[PDB]
Design a protein around this ligand. Structure first.
Ligand SMILES: Nc1nc2c(ncn2[C@@H]2O[C@H](COP(=O)(O)OP(=O)(O)NP(=O)(O)O)[C@@H](O)[C@H]2O)c(=O)[nH]1
Ligand SMILES: Nc1nc2c(ncn2[C@@H]2O[C@H](COP(=O)(O)OP(=O)(O)O)[C@@H](O)[C@H]2O)c(=O)[nH]1
Length: 414
């Protein structure tokens, strides 16, 4: 049989609202991310859609038809069980997509991505352009561009758009990003895309020795009304593990931790607890490595997690040595101009004393610029951030319009 393992890679599906995301993830996993089917034990997030599936391959059959997401090769001859390759995950935003602190969270999480393009829409729609830059900012490594709705246009028209795309990434990092044409609605050429993600979005190297770090993006009080006091469960923490691994029964801590305001002065003292359980989807595990969205059971007073109280925090082992700074130094790189409302907009260089919004992992706090230089700036922060590794990508954003907007990215230096 195939093994009941956990996902080992996260793929985010980004698509201009109405190009195919929700349906495309379904054509692959067989699940509908956005609005869906179970909560009694089905993995949930702050708001974003999420789905997982196994990936296999039939040894006898030819490709791409040989890739399967289920343990069967009948579809092409064999009564033989196909070869398992890996279990994967998909994340996307329900009938929408950026939401501004969401696209920033899903960044330290995404291992690769998929840009959905409607084949019956002139390329590139505005929202696609910004998705495109957002991905560059985010540092999206492995990318695949999917030409959706290809079944509603002619081969020639599809080809026409194909070129437009190829000659839009003609001079960017996307230079070679593959373009795969499909129909998520009617499921057409879906097998090629699965080949395409097996080739272009490979599972990243995993140094299992690195110190464990998980980004918290969800947390709650699982207890239902009526629960008896001696029978209630500890708080629960949903997040994605970035590096290392966590095991049930390990002592851990939450950073920055608990916000305490003694003497009218704010300050955060880390929150300690132990892992009571690890769950991926609806199945329990012993350990939790990077890949997929994991649910961690603790021994925390439900008041602590209740209603995503711990969102933006990170979990590490109790003795892990992780700074928690209220002032950080960032080696940055801005954008020349941002996708403005009308047509464009030019970004002003970082001016001192102006308030910005940085993203660190699943964190997003506002800070005041205290220092500003060619390649570096320093900022005071409203709330502190845990810095588990040296250079951790950060996303600088400015309330350009009336709405915050990415204006560059940088590395947190310590
Ligand atoms: N690791 C782990 N995860 C669990 C356990 N029990 C439940 N979960 C997680 O809890 C999730 C569902 O949470 P949910 O019941 O919707 O929280 P809630 O009851 O809406 N919080 P509230 O009652 O304040 O509205 C599932 O996706 C599942 O993974 C457990 O014992 N261990
Ligand atoms: N013809 C065609 N229609 C599609 C395809 N994928 C999705 N659709 C249509 O678009 C709708 C879903 O749009 P949706 O995926 O929710 O937009 P999103 O939430 O931004 O991803 C469905 O009602 C489908 O009828 C496709 O591959 N081909």
């Amino acid at each position: 049989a195939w093994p009941k393992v956990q996902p080992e890679v996260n793929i985010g599906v980004v698509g201009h609202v109405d190009h195919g995301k929700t349906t495309l993830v379904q054509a692959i996993t067989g699940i509908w991310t956005s609005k869906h089917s179970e909560e009694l034990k089905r993995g949930m997030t702050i708001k974003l859609g999420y789905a997982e599936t196994n990936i296999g391959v039939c040894e006898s059959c030819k490709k791409p038809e040989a890739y399967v997401t289920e343990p069967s090769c009948k579809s092409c001859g064999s009564d033989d069980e196909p070869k398992f390759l890996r279990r994967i995950s998909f994340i996307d935003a329900p009938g929408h997509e950026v939401l501004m602190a969401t696209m920033l969270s899903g960044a330290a999480l995404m291992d690769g991505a998929i840009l959905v393009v409607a084949a019956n829409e002139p390329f590139p729609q505005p929202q696609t352009r910004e998705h495109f830059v957002a991905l560059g900012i985010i540092g999206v490594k492995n990318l695949i561009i999917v030409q959706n709705k290809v079944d509603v246009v002619s081969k020639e028209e599809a080809l026409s758009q194909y070129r437009q795309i190829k000659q839009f990434t003609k001079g960017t990092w996307a230079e070679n990003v593959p373009i795969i044409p499909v129909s998520a609605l009617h499921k057409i050429n879906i097998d090629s895309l699965i080949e395409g993600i097996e080739e272009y979005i490979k599972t990243p190297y995993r140094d299992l020795s690195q110190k464990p770090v998980m980004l918290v993006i969800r947390s709650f009080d699982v207890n239902k009304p009526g629960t008896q006091f001696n029978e209630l469960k500890g708080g629960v923490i949903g997040g994605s593990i970035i590096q290392g691994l966590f095991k049930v029964d390990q002592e851990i801590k939450v950073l920055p931790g608990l916000r305490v305001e003694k003497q009218g002065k704010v300050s955060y003292e880390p929150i300690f607890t132990k892992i009571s359980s690890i769950r991926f989807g609806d199945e329990e595990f012993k350990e939790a490595k990077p890949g997929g969205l994991v649910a961690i059971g603790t021994y925390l007073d439900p008041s602590l997690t209740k209603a995503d109280n711990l969102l933006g925090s990170i979990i590490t082992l109790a003795d892990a040595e992780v700074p928690v700074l209220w002032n950080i130094r960032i080696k940055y790189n801005l954008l020349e101009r941002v996708v403005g409302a009308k047509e464009m907009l030019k970004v002003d260089p970082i001016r001192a004393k102006e308030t910005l919004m940085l993203s660190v992992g699943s964190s997003t706090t506002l800070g005041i610029v205290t220092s500003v230089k060619k390649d570096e700036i320093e900022v005071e922060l409203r709330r502190p951030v845990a810095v588990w590794s040296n250079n951790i990508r950060t996303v600088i954003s400015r309330q350009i319009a009336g709405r915050w907007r990415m204006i560059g990215w940088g590395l947190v230096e310590i």
